[PDB]
Write a protein that binds this ligand. Structure first.
Ligand SMILES: [Ca+2]
Ligand SMILES: [Ca+2]
Ligand code: NA
Lengths: 57, 223
């Protein structure tokens, strides 16, 4: 299973941290709200990290 | 804060906003140079914003001070979320008056049923997204450890406590983390986590500040 194809995971924590996830449907790295804990792998600190890891997925 | 109300400008003087290019967490000022927040709120280049109401507009009572130190509890577990507490030192001492003030630490733990004030600039919707400009407030009771454990089986540690309403509709949410849960003028909790926000049978989980008083005092004094 390609972790790049998993829906973004906010998690149970209550922070409002902006992270990037690869949106396979749109074919681009998009922003989403991360709660601060228990992150999945389709969660990046920058668009560049996201494209390098999941670009073309 | 879901199901809350507009606090009113600077009515919660100890509430601070942690900014990293935007608001991402809350915190509680415990003295002119120290802020208590959540360990999961540890981020790079934190700027503490005090005297805030409208988080998106400069209203004249703000104090923006960078964090000089960010001490996460040495036993913080990023998986279980145990010991979810962090101390932030301000690079320069905050100017205290009525609009910017510290909140007292507890002398003892709060009992179930005790009414508390929870505040923050987090999401105001249980389903959907809506972030407020001004600070939101919510009155909620401390819940029993038994009810908390029933709500979250195998997830509640001795350093966590639930607060809220089991019927749903009132809770802290994304953007509120690190913020205060004040009961009888004492900082009893830190917004931490939960299953979604304001969901039935899923009250918010908070860090039990009363278990860390000695650690907080000694840590601040040794930094
Ligand atoms: Ca996007
Ligand atoms: Ca402002
Ligand atoms: Na205002």
């Amino acid at each position: 299973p390609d972790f790049c194809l998993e829906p973004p995971y906010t998690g149970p924590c209550k922070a409002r941290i902006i992270r990037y996830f690869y949106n396979a449907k749109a074919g681009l790295c998009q922003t989403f709200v991360y709660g601060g804990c228990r992150a999945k792998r389709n969660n990046f600190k920058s668009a560049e990290d996201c494209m390098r890891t999941c670009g073309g997925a | 804060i879901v199901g809350g109300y507009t606090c009113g400008a600077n009515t919660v003087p100890y509430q601070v906003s942690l900014n990293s290019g935007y608001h991402f967490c809350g915190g509680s000022l415990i003295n002119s140079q120290w802020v208590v927040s959540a360990a999961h709120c540890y981020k790079s280049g934190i700027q503490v914003r005090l005297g805030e109401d409208n988080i998106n507009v400069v209203e004249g009572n703000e104090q923006f001070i960078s964090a000089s130190k960010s001490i996460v509890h040495p036993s913080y577990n990023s998986n279980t979320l145990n010991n979810d507490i962090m101390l932030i030192k301000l690079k320069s001492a905050a100017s205290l008056x009525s609009r910017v003030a510290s909140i007292s630490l507890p002398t003892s733990c709060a009992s179930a049923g005790t009414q508390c004030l929870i505040s923050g600039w987090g999401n105001t919707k249980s389903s959907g997204t809506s972030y407020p400009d001004v600070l939101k407030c919510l009155k909620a009771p401390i819940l029993s450890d038994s009810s908390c454990k029933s709500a979250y089986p195998g997830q509640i540690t001795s350093n966590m406590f639930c607060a809220g309403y089991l019927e749903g509709g009132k809770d802290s949410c994304q953007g509120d983390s690190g913020g205060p849960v004040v009961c009888s003028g004492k900082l009893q909790g830190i917004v931490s986590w939960g299953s979604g926000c304001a969901q039935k049978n899923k009250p918010g989980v908070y860090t039990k500040v009363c278990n860390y008083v000695s650690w907080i005092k000694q840590t601040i004094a040794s930094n």
